[PDB]
């Protein structure tokens, strides 16, 4: 799907920071609630997560109206190589606090 590169950067940064993603399955929602002040439509998030799922990077669940996505190890490696993050950075999920 066609979208500006900064939207993809923001979505991937949020996904790697948190480790999980939630969406409402609303292609007409003007902007994702979590991605505020960055002007990312919900449709872009849905399609980006679908593209990630097709490659095995994220695991998907659907509940009552919502998409839930969890990050896989190969997805972690792909995001780390994509965002040029140092090997000392891990998502908040992988930290047993």
């Amino acid at each position: 799907m066609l979208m500006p590169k900064k939207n993809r950067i923001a979505i991937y940064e949020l996904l790697f920071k948190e480790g999980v993603m939630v969406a409402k399955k609303d292609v007409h929602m003007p902007k994702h609630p979590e991605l505020a002040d960055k002007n990312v439509p919900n449709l872009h998030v849905m399609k980006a997560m679908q593209s990630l799922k097709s490659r095995g990077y994220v695991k998907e669940q659907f509940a009552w109206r919502h998409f839930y996505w969890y990050l896989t190890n190969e997805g972690i490696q792909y995001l780390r190589d994509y965002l040029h993050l140092p090997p000392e950075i891990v998502p908040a999920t992988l930290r047993r606090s």
Binding site: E18, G19, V20, M21, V22, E34, Q61, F62, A63, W64, H66, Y68, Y70, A92, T93, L94, R96
Partner: protein, 79 residues
Amino acid sequence: VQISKKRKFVADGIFKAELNEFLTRELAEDGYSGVEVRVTPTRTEIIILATRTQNVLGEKGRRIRELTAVVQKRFGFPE
């Protein structure tokens, strides 16, 4: 402002129903039995009853640490 007691109890019931449905779909493989929500002004605790807790917790507690994330993401109440 605030909502009336009728709406409050109906909303609590709907939240519990949706939470149970999501937990069922997620943890059917782990012998998920039920969910019990104990509401305290400090924190809202959720007890997950299942046959085996090893799969629910995951390795080093990863999987459960994921669930308590998405729940917080879904219903929106603060971290």
